[PDB]
Every structure is written in C-alpha cells, then in structure tokens.
Design an enzyme around this catalytic site. Structure first.
Site, short mmCIF file in Angstrom:
data_model
loop_
_atom_site.label_atom_id
_atom_site.label_comp_id
_atom_site.label_asym_id
_atom_site.label_seq_id
_atom_site.Cartn_x
_atom_site.Cartn_y
_atom_site.Cartn_z
N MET A 1 -40.52 -7.46 -21.06
CA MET A 1 -40.37 -6.69 -19.75
C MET A 1 -39.20 -5.90 -19.52
SD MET A 1 -43.24 -8.70 -17.41
CE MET A 1 -42.10 -10.18 -16.94
N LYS B 1 -51.08 -7.36 -15.22
CA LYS B 1 -49.84 -7.53 -15.96
C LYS B 1 -50.04 -8.88 -16.38
CE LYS B 1 -45.40 -5.94 -16.35
NZ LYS B 1 -44.04 -5.59 -15.70
N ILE C 1 -38.74 -4.37 -11.76
CA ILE C 1 -37.49 -4.92 -11.77
C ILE C 1 -36.09 -3.78 -11.66
CG2 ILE C 1 -36.78 -5.92 -13.96
CD1 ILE C 1 -35.39 -8.28 -12.49
N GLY C 2 -36.57 -2.78 -12.69
CA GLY C 2 -35.76 -1.47 -12.80
C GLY C 2 -36.61 -0.38 -12.65
N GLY C 3 -37.56 -0.19 -12.21
CA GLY C 3 -38.82 0.68 -12.18
C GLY C 3 -40.00 0.41 -12.81
N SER C 4 -40.53 -0.73 -12.90
CA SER C 4 -41.47 -1.35 -13.82
C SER C 4 -42.97 -0.96 -13.34
CB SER C 4 -41.15 -2.63 -14.37
OG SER C 4 -40.56 -2.21 -15.64
N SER D 1 -42.35 -1.63 -17.38
CA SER D 1 -43.04 -2.64 -18.19
C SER D 1 -44.29 -2.80 -18.06
CB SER D 1 -42.27 -3.94 -18.16
OG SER D 1 -41.92 -4.54 -16.76
N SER D 2 -45.09 -2.24 -16.66
CA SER D 2 -46.24 -2.50 -16.47
C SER D 2 -47.22 -1.39 -17.21
CB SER D 2 -46.63 -2.47 -14.75
OG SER D 2 -45.63 -3.49 -14.31
O1 LIG Z 1 -29.20 1.14 -23.68
C1 LIG Z 1 -28.22 0.18 -23.32
C2 LIG Z 1 -28.66 -1.19 -23.29
N1 LIG Z 1 -29.86 -1.58 -22.67
C3 LIG Z 1 -29.98 -1.56 -21.00
C4 LIG Z 1 -31.27 -1.64 -20.39
C5 LIG Z 1 -31.27 -2.09 -19.17
C6 LIG Z 1 -32.49 -2.03 -18.37
C7 LIG Z 1 -32.44 -2.84 -17.17
C8 LIG Z 1 -33.39 -3.12 -16.48
C9 LIG Z 1 -34.79 -2.53 -16.96
C10 LIG Z 1 -34.90 -1.71 -18.03
C11 LIG Z 1 -33.75 -1.35 -18.62
O2 LIG Z 1 -35.97 -1.23 -18.43
C12 LIG Z 1 -37.01 -0.69 -17.31
C13 LIG Z 1 -37.16 -2.09 -16.44
O3 LIG Z 1 -35.89 -2.64 -16.12
N2 LIG Z 1 -30.18 -2.03 -18.40
C14 LIG Z 1 -28.79 -2.05 -19.00
N3 LIG Z 1 -28.77 -1.56 -20.38
C15 LIG Z 1 -26.88 0.50 -23.77
C16 LIG Z 1 -25.80 -0.04 -23.28
C17 LIG Z 1 -24.57 0.34 -24.03
C18 LIG Z 1 -24.33 0.83 -25.22
C19 LIG Z 1 -25.50 1.43 -25.83
C20 LIG Z 1 -26.73 1.49 -25.10
#
Ligand SMILES: O[C@@H](CNc1cc(-c2ccc3c(c2)OCCO3)ncn1)c1ccccc1
EC number: 3.5.1.99
Length: 543
Positions: A160, A111, A207-210, A186-187
C-alpha cells in the site's frame, strides 16, 4: 532462488480469487433465472440516497440490489482485475441485516487491508498469505451493525506504499476508462470498481493520497478525514507505531451525498462504544447542509509538482464557477511545502530508514510498480548520506528525499514530531489570519500510465501535504481531459527537470477523455464542512 514460498503464496491467492469469482457468478446467474424481468441497469444507475430510500421503504428487496450489483462487479472485474475475494458469508448477512439501519441492504466494497473474518488481508505480501482474520475490523462491525452487506475485498499495490495498484499475488488492477492507465492507489481496486458501477459505496485508507488518487484517476468522490475521526482498529498494515504522519480511513463513492451518508452511518454510538479511543463527535448535519457563502483559499500550483493543463483548467474553472455562486476566492499557499514533503512527511514515514517496512519483503517478490523504493530503503544509511551529498547540487529534490530516508535516534524523531506539531499550527495561523473556511486545491490528474507512479514520487505533493498537516481533505471530479489539454502536455517542463518530472510528463500523456478532479480541504475535525464545500463543487461542475 529463495522464492519457494513466494511462488506458492501467489498460486493459492489466485485460486482463492478464481474460486471467489466463480462463486459470485454461479450465485448471480441462479438469481437471474428467478428474476428475469427486472430493471438491472435502472438499479445500478440509481444514486445511493435513492437506493437506501427504496430499500428502507421496501420498494426493492435486498437480494435484488445485492445480486444486481454482485453481477455488475463481476462483469467490470473482467477488464480491471479489482476483486481479490468474495466475502463468503455476505449472503447470510443480507438475511439477518439490522432492519432500521442507515445502510440497510447497501452492499459495500472494502479495500483489502480492512480485516474481515476468515479472509486474508494480504496487502499483496506473501508473509500475510494463509492468515485469515480472527474477526472483522471495528468499522466493518459498524457497517454490518448499520445494515450494510460488505461483499468484496478490492485489490491494493504490494504494501500500500504506492499510488499505482499491482502486487505479485493478484497482479495489476487497471483503470476502467482506459486499461493502459493506472486506477490510482493504494485504494485502486476500490476506485476501479466504484468508478465503473461495481459498487455504490466503499472504504479506503489514505496515508500519502491513497483515497484521493484513485477517486481522481477513476473519476469518483472520496474523503480522507482527520486521522482519528474514525477507528483504525483492525486494519492490516505494514508498520505499527509510526504516529507522526497518521494514517486516515474514509469513504469512497460515486457522489458527495453518498460520502456524507456513510460518515453519518459510521459516526454513531456503536463506533464510539466499540472504540472509545475515537472522540465521540457526532456527524453535524447542520454544517453539512449549510448554504452560507464561503471564504475559500486557493492555489493553482504548489510550486513543487507542476500541474497538468487539465488540472490547471479544472482548478480555474471551479475557482470562477464558485466566484459566480458568491463565494470569496482568496490566494493562499502553506509555507515551506518542500520542507513538509522532503523533511517532515518523508522523515515521518521512514523515520527508521525503512527497516520495519522491509521485513514485510524478506524472501518475497518486489512488484515493479514500487519502483526503486525497496531498493533505496535496502541501501545502507552511510551510502544514502554520501549519495545525497553528491546529488544535492544536481538534483536537490531527489537528494533531499534520500537524506531524510535514513534511520534516526529517538531524540531526533521527538524533534521531528515537534516540528510537525508546530508546522500544523504554523499553517493554521495562515488559515485563521485570512479567515478562510475551506481551501481549494489542484489534484494530480489525469491518471498516470501503469508502472509510472512508482518512479514519479514528487507528484504526491498535492495530497501528502494534508496527511502531514492532518487536515480533512477530499476530491471531486470536475471535468474531463480535452485534446487541447492533452496537446498542451508536450509543453510541460516541470519545476525541477529531474526524472520525477520527466516520468510524469510522459505518464500523463494520452489521456483524452479521462476525468480530472480538484481537492477540497478544511481545518481538523471539520469533515462535515469539507463535504459541504465538496458538495458545492459537485453541484457547480456537473454537465
Ligand atoms: O521514488 C523514490 C522512493 N519512493 C518513495 C515513495 C514515497 C511514498 C510515500 C507515501 C505514499 C506513496 C509513496 O505512495 C502513495 C501513498 O503513500 N515517499 C518517498 N519515497 C525515490 C527516492 C530517492 C531517489 C529515487 C527515488
């Protein structure tokens, strides 16, 4: 109008990419002239354990396995766009590879965030373009020291922080089974490449499933260990000093044995000498190879993200196949999952309201696949709290993420960091009270459409939970989407009905034939148990 440097950055990245691939090709075809009668698809086919065996005994030369995989990677890259760079010097490393190393002559994809000397680790961001690493990250040194030949930097979504896989520098990576679909993230470049035979083994971050998303979406194995089982020294990131939700790195490979090979190779005295902040826990082969009946927790839903039919069927078919093998399946669900996701994990990642994250984006193009994250974090914190208090009755799931993506004072993040410790022990107490060994779990699948993951944030729930708990968690592909399952997708309604449910409803349609996986989990520092159980699942669900 202030995208001068963004437009310039991208042009350089694509020519560097194009020069890498053009170099890879002229390398491969040189080789094939002098090695015509050579069984390249038997080689590419060979499982990793097999392959090391022949490399170590000297049945196949390192140049053969290098230049065969080097060609294949280049071929699969044409459909997928998953190779950023060709690592220059790997031809030189091949000749001076540590000869009695456990990965002698194994070529290995990395990566992009893994620092490699003389190569950018851009993370899709123009601020990191033209800034080559002074030296290899600690894990790459161990890889090279254990005899491996790291050969490509595979693509990632801008920053990522996304389980899709596009950025304005190198563009979008696609799923090798179906180009309309995301490869995961992200990977994503890793999964796309490994999942199509482009590499026997590679390295990801989660970090969130990547690690787990792209493994599942592209139909390969992957393990997210406990955060500090391995050395994060030298990995390129957006944010530094966020410790509440800890990032974790681990292997990705076509089978579970490969993964266990790879950890056994990295968890050695090189790693622990080179980074003494990692606890010198040697890989315990005894536990990995055990055949003792397991007490296995399970749940076919987290009551947060409604699983697809494929997921649900994958989970039940495994649950029952495991029962037939004699393992004891027990219903188990961690307390307050919405709290862990909406309050703890989200609060942990954006404790500062995004301002650290966002300075990576100043004067840069924002990739569409990041969705509304950058726009949401860019909003001021009074407007997030107001807008949250309006949405909460109508859209609690969305209002709650918004409420916990505001900046806070050091006193409040101490309080959040304590709740994480307590929550981790809270779930450990559930675990121990039912005497479970491991825990079977659904896993988001089949692969989402492109530019869907960015606007379907609820679906992180299955993986994110175990970043939050910091439990070792891996995925195994168990089945493929039937037309019966794809048809059952139009009765999918979701537990909330908000737009994350609606986007993922459509995103998961038209996925006949794509692979679907299950998630395996163990307590902290029990990576070798997690792989024993993953290996069990692998044996019982092969066709
Ligand atoms: O879409 C959301 C905003 N985006 C995110 C994204 C992520 C997030 C965290 C870790 C990740 C990840 C995504 O992707 C995979 C790897 O790790 N966490 C929280 N919010 C939103 C919020 C309020 C209103 C409308 C829309």
């Amino acid at each position: 109008t202030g995208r001068q440097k963004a437009r310039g950055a991208a042009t350089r990245a694509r020519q560097k990419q194009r020069a890498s691939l053009e170099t890879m090709d002229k390398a491969v075809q040189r080789f094939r002239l002098q090695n015509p009668d050579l069984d390249s698809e038997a080689l590419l086919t060979l499982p990793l354990l097999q392959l090391v065996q022949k490399l170590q005994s000297g049945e196949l030369s390192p140049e053969a396995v290098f230049f065969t995989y080097l060609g294949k990677a280049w071929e699969v890259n044409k459909g997928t766009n998953c190779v950023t760079s060709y690592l220059t010097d790997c031809e030189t490393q091949l000749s001076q590879a540590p000869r009695q190393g456990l990965l002698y002559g194994v070529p290995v994809s990395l990566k992009e965030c893994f620092s490699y000397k003389g190569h950018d680790s851009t993370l899709g961001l123009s601020l990191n373009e033209g800034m080559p690493s002074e030296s290899d990250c600690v894990v790459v040194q161990v890889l090279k020291l254990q005899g491996a030949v790291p050969f490509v930097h595979t693509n990632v979504p801008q920053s990522m922080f996304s389980y899709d896989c596009s950025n304005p520098l190198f563009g979008q990576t696609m799923n090798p089974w179906k180009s309309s679909k995301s490869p995961g993230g992200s990977s994503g470049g890793e999964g796309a490449l490994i999942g199509s035979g482009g590499s026997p083994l590679g390295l990801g971050t989660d970090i969130g499933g990547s690690i787990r998303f792209p493994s599942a979406f592209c139909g390969i194995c992957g393990l997210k260990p406990t955060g500090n089982r391995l050395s994060k020294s030298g990995l390129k990131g957006c944010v530094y000093g966020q410790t509440a939700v800890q990032l974790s790195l681990g292997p990705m490979a076509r089978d579970v044995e490969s993964l266990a090979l790879c950890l056994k190779a990295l968890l050695c005295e090189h790693l622990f000498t080179l980074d003494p902040t990692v606890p010198p826990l040697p890989f315990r082969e005894e536990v990995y190879r055990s055949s003792r009946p397991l007490r296995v927790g399970y749940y076919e839903t987290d009551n947060y993200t409604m699983p697809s039919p494929a997921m649900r069927r994958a989970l039940i078919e495994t649950k029952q196949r495991l029962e037939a093998a004699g393992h004891t399946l027990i219903p188990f669900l961690p307390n307050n999952i919405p709290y862990a996701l909406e309050v703890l994990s989200t609060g942990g990642l954006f404790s500062d309201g995004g301002r650290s994250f966002l300075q990576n984006f100043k004067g840069d193009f924002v990739d569409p696949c990041l969705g509304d994250l950058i726009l949401i974090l860019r909003l001021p914190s009074w407007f997030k709290r107001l807008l949250s208090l309006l949405l909460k009755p109508l859209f609690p799931r969305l209002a709650a993420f918004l409420n916990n993506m505001r900046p806070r004072s050091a006193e409040k993040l101490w309080k959040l960091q304590h709740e994480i410790e307590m929550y981790r022990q809270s779930v450990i107490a559930q675990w121990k009270a039912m005497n479970l060994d491991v825990l079977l779990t659904p896993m988001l699948g089949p692969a989402l459409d492109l530019n869907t993951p960015g606007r379907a944030t609820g679906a992180v729930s299955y993986t994110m939970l175990y970043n939050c708990l910091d439990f070792p968690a891996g995925v195994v592909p168990v089945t493929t989407v039937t037309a019966e399952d794809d048809a059952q997708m139009e009765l999918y309604k979701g537990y909330f009905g908000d737009i994350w449910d609606i986007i993922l409803k459509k995103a998961m349609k038209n996925s006949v034939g794509l692979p679907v996986a299950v998630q395996c989990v163990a307590l902290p520092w029990q990576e070798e148990l997690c792989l024993r159980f993953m290996r069990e699942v692998e044996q019982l669900m092969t066709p």
